[PDB]
Design a protein around this ligand. Structure first.
Ligand SMILES: Nc1nc2c(ncn2[C@@H]2O[C@H](COP(=O)(O)OP(=O)(O)OP(=O)(O)O)[C@@H](O)[C@H]2O)c(=O)[nH]1
Ligand SMILES: Nc1nc2c(ncn2[C@@H]2O[C@H](COP(=O)(O)OP(=O)(O)OP(=O)(O)O)[C@@H](O)[C@H]2O)c(=O)[nH]1
Ligand SMILES: Nc1nc2c(ncn2[C@@H]2O[C@H](COP(=O)(O)OP(=O)(O)OP(=O)(O)O)[C@@H](O)[C@H]2O)c(=O)[nH]1
Ligand SMILES: Nc1ncnc2c1ncn2[C@@H]1O[C@H](COP(=O)(O)OP(=O)(O)OP(=O)(O)O)[C@@H](O)[C@H]1O
Ligand SMILES: Nc1ncnc2c1ncn2[C@@H]1O[C@H](COP(=O)(O)OP(=O)(O)OP(=O)(O)O)[C@@H](O)[C@H]1O
Ligand SMILES: Nc1ncnc2c1ncn2[C@@H]1O[C@H](COP(=O)(O)OP(=O)(O)OP(=O)(O)O)[C@@H](O)[C@H]1O
Ligand SMILES: [Cl-]
Ligand SMILES: [Cl-]
Ligand SMILES: [Cl-]
Ligand SMILES: [Mg+2]
Ligand SMILES: [Mg+2]
Ligand SMILES: [Mg+2]
Lengths: 248, 248, 248
């Protein structure tokens, strides 16, 4: 006759559950694991474009002014008029659109990394509308190291991810955007030294990308974030994610 | 008076032909040569999307669920309805398309490598519809090493390429897909060690890509495969390619 | 009472201006600086597609036959007919378009690098319409080193950039195109050796891209080149750029 559940050190079902969750958390943090990046572009109509990349060793996303704009697939997007918006945004008075402010422009950006990133390695190039980091190429460092600004997304006392959020509320907030982060490596084994370097090149090939525009934050939270155990931070500063280490 | 053709060791025209073919085969296998990857997505209407990349040192292709779907350029693709298909495939009951199964979904994938690949280096991430390799990121190795499954495409006793083929016949066969392979290097000279590493970075830049949807396998065989001396394996297990080493 | 402007060595405003310009020029040339690449595709209707990438350490652009073709956003591009053009260009007599020559085909290409490139590192793969560098993969070196052909764009005796220009005036000038260059590094410190290699991988992530089709060379010169202090060479061999080193 077996011990009774939840009363002794022989609840092996319980120990196996805790190990299963701990193994996933720590595997993700091993050099064999993913590091993941999400870039969220929020539009005035309440919809949200997500750009996601999942890869070994390091991960990144690179967007231009045009690629960040809202596209409603299979609906009217006034493509000619929006090309004229682009011309008017690349150079002042450079186009002839029928509008002052395109509602396809993002109102905000949230950058989220998986908990397997090392925040000290995070780099971002938030450039102008023609993809220069700081106004002119000749004065541009090709990135800023913005890790100190990333907030921890905590759930149940566990870091389930990292967030950097900035609004684009002003008419001159017209941007291009690239972001990069490196997977944790507390060892002194360089994953990109000659013993393993070609595998890092293969990781550039193997990185999986995902993009979709969700009709609102609720839908994103329900059918993307929660569905796939991703970290998130909503407009009301509510934290989402699944804590795993040492937990049932 | 010259020797008679095909009767002696002084048929220099004959020797030059054989060397020409041998030189092409072996150049392709040198570190100076191409390694090439083709991903074929087969649709129920009989058409075939090819994605090709040709590059030095290593090569790869990365696709998401959406990018693998059939697009008939300049014809009706019901873009709104197919966006709803995507929503319904990213999460169950997540959309409202007018169909149960999109005929734009691939029925099968064939992955073919040039004979200059080392099959031991082949990696594939066959992920789910939101670009996670194995259901959740926390448990995902970012690839599987599938080389042992690649079949040799033989012609005249020569390996003209390698094939891995899998059908997607079930309703739940909704995938994302990345593939990578490394060019043969039997030497102990690491092409990505510091003496040559920046050239491997340049190869990422220089890799040439090609995509097209052919109306059927016959057309692909005739105007793509055969036209450009590529390897192929058709649905009837017939092998295509041009044998070169030691041959006239 | 301060010295009079432009009469002595105590015009600190003057010295600061000259240093400001010199600092930008030399920063651009430091390993911290950008290296930039522009590929210009010129169309018969006088418009010009620019593809630009700006990145640390090294930079590149890769295009196929299709991606180089003129696309007039929000206007009629006869997409079905132009897909048939593609089929007819990938293989002779392979399509059924309503035209002999597509006016969407580029008439010329100009490749321009920032002055921070090392011309000895420049590589180009000018391939055929199906993205093979030299007719067949088996005989293809994956690039040509074309630096000796690049012309210096001089302004006021300063090199503000480098240009390689080739026309595509013949019916058989149907190409694919990739180009790559490496940022100057006169030091013996290898930026891609293990001490800094992962940063070069991050630079692949962080590279910012830009594309736009301008209606004519005048507009490109005015609202792109000149607006953002880029180098250029127009059809009349007129040089554009801003000289900076040692200059007010
Ligand atoms: N830790 C703790 N949790 C409480 C307390 N009161 C209510 N709770 C709830 O209980 C949850 C934690 O329960 P457990 O996971 O079983 O307890 P634990 O502290 O993690 O201990 P172990 O999992 O056995 O290591 C919390 O998420 C709370 O919502 C309390 O006093 N202490
Ligand atoms: N090898 C071989 N080929 C045959 C034979 N009978 C018919 N053939 C045909 O001949 C072809 C090969 O001819 P060759 O290439 O001239 O002969 P080989 O064996 O390759 O000899 P070398 O090219 O001179 O080294 C094959 O593809 C067959 O289709 C036979 O008995 N032996
Ligand atoms: N150098 C030079 N410039 C001239 C001369 N005559 C007219 N110019 C104009 O003057 C410009 C250069 O003027 P400066 O920049 O003040 O002279 P500089 O030779 O560069 O000398 P510093 O800037 O003081 O080092 C040129 O771009 C010319 O258009 C001349 O004889 N010599
Ligand atoms: N009432 C409680 N008393 C004592 N410990 C608690 C209580 N509730 C939770 N904890 C414990 O405190 C730790 C942190 O959990 P907590 O719920 O505060 O994290 P959180 O979700 O980041 O909190 P919040 O989001 O509310 O700021 C966990 O180990 C948890 O078990
Ligand atoms: N009738 C034959 N007798 C002897 N050798 C042959 C004959 N036909 C071909 N060969 C030789 O056998 C070797 C293998 O050629 P073979 O035609 O069997 O390759 P294959 O195209 O892979 O065959 P298959 O596709 O029919 O399985 C070659 O060196 C070829 O010259
Ligand atoms: N009339 C002049 N007499 C002497 N030096 C000059 C004169 N005009 C310019 N320079 C100097 O000559 C150097 C080269 O300037 P220059 O204007 O010839 O360059 P550039 O723009 O490449 O010429 P161009 O485009 O006309 O061939 C600069 O240092 C400049 O100060
Ligand atoms: Cl590890
Ligand atoms: Cl070699
Ligand atoms: Cl430096
Ligand atoms: Mg607990
Ligand atoms: Mg023979
Ligand atoms: Mg001067």
């Amino acid at each position: 006759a077996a011990d009774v559940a939840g009363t002794s050190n022989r609840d092996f079902r319980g120990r196996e559950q805790r190990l299963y969750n701990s193994e996933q958390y720590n595997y993700n943090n091993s050099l064999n694991g993913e590091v993941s990046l999400w870039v969220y572009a929020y539009y005035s109509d309440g919809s949200v474009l997500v750009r996601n990349c999942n890869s070994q060793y390091k991960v990144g996303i690179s967007e231009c002014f045009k690629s960040l704009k809202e596209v409603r697939v299979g609906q009217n997007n006034d493509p000619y008029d929006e090309q004229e918006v682009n011309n008017g945004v690349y150079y002042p008075n450079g186009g002839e659109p029928t509008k002052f402010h395109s509602n396809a422009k993002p109102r905000a950006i949230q950058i989220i990394f998986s908990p397997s990133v090392n925040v000290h390695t995070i780099k971002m190039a938030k450039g102008n509308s023609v993809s220069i980091p700081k106004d002119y190429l000749q004065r541009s460092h090709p990135w800023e190291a913005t890790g100190v600004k990333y907030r921890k997304i905590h759930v149940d006392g566990e870091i389930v991810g990292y967030s950097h959020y900035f609004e684009l509320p002003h008419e001159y907030n017209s941007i291009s955007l690239s972001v990069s982060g490196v997977h944790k490596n507390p060892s002194s084994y360089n994953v990109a030294a000659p013993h393993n370097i070609m595998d890092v090149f293969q990781s550039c090939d193997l990185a999986l990308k995902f993009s979709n525009r969700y009709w609102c934050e609720l839908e994103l939270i329900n059918h993307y974030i929660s569905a796939y155990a991703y970290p998130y931070l909503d407009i009301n500063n509510h934290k989402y994610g699944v804590p795993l280490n040492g937990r049932q």
